[PDB]
Design an enzyme around this catalytic site. Sequence first.
Site, PDB file in Angstrom:
ATOM      1  N   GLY B  10       1.634  12.412 -22.644  1.00  0.00           N
ATOM      2  CA  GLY B  10       0.857  11.500 -23.008  1.00  0.00           C
ATOM      3  C   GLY B  10       1.093  10.220 -22.580  1.00  0.00           C
ATOM      4  O   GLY B  10       1.540   9.928 -21.385  1.00  0.00           O
ATOM      5  N   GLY B  11       0.773   8.826 -23.454  1.00  0.00           N
ATOM      6  CA  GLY B  11       1.096   7.672 -22.811  1.00  0.00           C
ATOM      7  C   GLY B  11       2.756   7.353 -22.834  1.00  0.00           C
ATOM      8  O   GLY B  11       3.205   6.314 -22.445  1.00  0.00           O
ATOM      9  N   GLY B 251       6.096   2.237  16.830  1.00  0.00           N
ATOM     10  CA  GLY B 251       5.825   1.608  15.500  1.00  0.00           C
ATOM     11  C   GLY B 251       6.966   1.856  14.740  1.00  0.00           C
ATOM     12  O   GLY B 251       7.575   0.963  13.966  1.00  0.00           O
ATOM     13  N   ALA B 252       7.661   3.021  14.468  1.00  0.00           N
ATOM     14  CA  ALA B 252       8.967   3.348  13.879  1.00  0.00           C
ATOM     15  C   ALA B 252       9.934   2.034  13.888  1.00  0.00           C
ATOM     16  O   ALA B 252      10.416   1.772  12.938  1.00  0.00           O
ATOM     17  CB  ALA B 252       9.250   4.573  14.143  1.00  0.00           C
TER      18      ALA B 252
END
Lengths: 347, 365, 164
Positions: B10-11, B251-252
């Site tokens: 749950g929460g 880009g890497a």
Amino acid sequence: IDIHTTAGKLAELHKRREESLHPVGEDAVEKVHAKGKLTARERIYALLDEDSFVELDALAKHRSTNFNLGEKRPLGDGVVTGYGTIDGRDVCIFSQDATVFGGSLGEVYGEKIVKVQELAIKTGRPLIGINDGAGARIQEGVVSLGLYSRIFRNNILASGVIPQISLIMGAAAGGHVYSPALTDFVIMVDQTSQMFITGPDVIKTVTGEEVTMEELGGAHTHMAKSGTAHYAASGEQDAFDYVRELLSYLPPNNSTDAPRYQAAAPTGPIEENLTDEDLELDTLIPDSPNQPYDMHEVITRLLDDEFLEIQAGYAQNIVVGFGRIDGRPVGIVANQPTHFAGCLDIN
Amino acid sequence: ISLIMGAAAGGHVYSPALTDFVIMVDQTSQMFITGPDVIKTVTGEEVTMEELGGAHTHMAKSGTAHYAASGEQDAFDYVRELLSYLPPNNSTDAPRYQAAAPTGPIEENLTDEDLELDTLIPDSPNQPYDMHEVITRLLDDEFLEIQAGYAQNIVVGFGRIDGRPVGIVANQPTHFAGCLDINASEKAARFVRTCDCFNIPIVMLVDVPGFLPGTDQEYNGIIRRGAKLLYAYGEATVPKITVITRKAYGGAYCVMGSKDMGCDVNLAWPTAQIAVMGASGAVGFVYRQQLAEAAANGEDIDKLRLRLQQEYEDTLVNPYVAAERGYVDAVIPPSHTRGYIGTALRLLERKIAQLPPKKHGNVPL
Amino acid sequence: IDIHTTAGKLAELHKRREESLHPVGEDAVEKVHAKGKLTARERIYALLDEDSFVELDALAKHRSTNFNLGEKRPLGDGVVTGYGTIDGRDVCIFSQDATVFGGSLGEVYGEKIVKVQELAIKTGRPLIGINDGAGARIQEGVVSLGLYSRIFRNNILASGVIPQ
């Protein structure tokens, strides 16, 4: 035509200012129109207010000498940058020319974009970028990657300070696509525009999966699969109408108030100012606890009509978007009972 | 720090997610929003609490748990260790252990261990090697790895260099050849932000050939999720030191603590290969026409495409092009690495970095 | 020494590293010594504390191709930048090599200096500049002018912040 006199020099300038309108010949502009698409600048002219554009570095040329690159040096480098105004408000913009080196980014090309980025942050005005072009220009070397970083860096520096809009009307492959993600809103053309790191070819020869550019990264997949696209324009012009509409709700920067329209001056109480459209909400919720109902029915009845939905084709179980309540721009966030009963999910 | 030592439903599961570190105990600890019962009486799926949300899964599948302890005691040990690297709050500097005072220069304080790095890199350009061999030799021994059983193609964790706490972020050549993917990216992004929050220098060991190809990577949002690593780094203001041991393409290269990305000191090993892309697919673009006349006129491609691939490789794919541009502060021997990071951390000790005034950024989520 | 092997690449580095100490042959170094002057590098070593200097952009080379300038591309581009200490305290420094293009400022040469400045300001430590050379390299063009301005600006930004 003495190139030594003042008059000859001014004449020389007008010749270049002229060639910059078609850096790679007029025949190239023909093919572009022959595809129903617009030119890098024609797009800026379309989006920005009439005659408000002020071009920058219009005559810049690349300075490379690798792999016989010094052979072809078009004016502009393949990018159109500058500033203008969208509905009377100053904005900084740049558009990529796919006809020039396939729209690939080089050093000068990068410098031109970096310049606009710094201008927008410095003036505290929005930054609009129209993307369309292949990856970095390999011939120039790693300089392109270095300038790439410089561009990303400014995007994350401006994040949340200056509204940043990204318009994908082309292909756009490579690290080029990372810039748009860093911005606030990504607008695509469904079909006429893609977006992806690796092209179908490589993907093919490394995984075997056979896919087309559209399938791999079209407006529809980034709208319902990756959740990267905020809007899928039916055509280029529509893409622009969206961008202006989006800016109409946002302020020039985080230190400024969102623009407001004239707010009506009622007399109250609310129970006496109730309209027919209002009362319609008293009976909108079904007598059954599970029977779903379109949440848009509530939205449209609350504000001055006309909701600019964001990511309408992604996670339809939640509805988000811009609108105006009493001339005041507000952000709407509602659960859509007509999908997954309104439940919340990852997306 | 969030310790999960039982079944959390749950929460009771949102608090942990919001904290910085989540430590679980394998077997005796679960974590899920909805239980198997409800799931079954709704989707028809049949699962146990252990499969649904045990440490095994939250570590290797969801990427939520930063550690999967074997016993509760192990869990405590991890937290106790974890806290030894972090300060009490973001207003205080990370605790330091008695720093060592050498004699200098670096070339004179090279242990037999440091030297082992000079021959660590294979002669074969694509032969794998575990990046752990480089981490162990750099830090003062003892690596507290984060999410070790998740996105193994990237390694992140805490360790010390000259008594100084540092956040290690390196690629793993022994998994996807070091490539970056959604998960690895997110794994690093959050870690980077965490280091910055609590003033922990970020040391990056580069060796990525690019991004892992695949339709799934795209559909699942690699572009969007990948950006997070970029965002995190570009945002950081803590001392940043990057060392490229081998590959660094496209880009890497950028997303990997690249000079223009805000990195303070960038180092490179002689075996570095910094370029837009591999010499393999490079020739296809560069020597385009020359290869066009290899099918028409003088035709032999495949013996031409291999000569050109070697010439381009032997002239452009190296650490000097980048060094000449300044994107690399200096190209030094692998053995020198440890000592270099030490002086660098000292120089950047009281670094000054001011981020643009704003309530907060808008990193992609 | 195979350029294709790790051992060869390592040996290659130590080869350039050695050359960077005399970017224009030994003779040039014996020429300044014969004049009773120290080398741009030797000066840095003299000032700073023994075994403390850490050189930056040592293997840098100019990327110009104007007026047969591509023939001579010396390592360091005429300037020695980096950091170290003076009486135990950290400092940033750059020395100009008058034997390389006359100490003239070029694009790369300028970039190296700009980098040191930005370091000094960032780390909050003193910036020592040892000047010795001609104006700008006429061959490289206005590029040097832009960089000169860049250097001047960083100078005033640091003014009153960092002892220069």
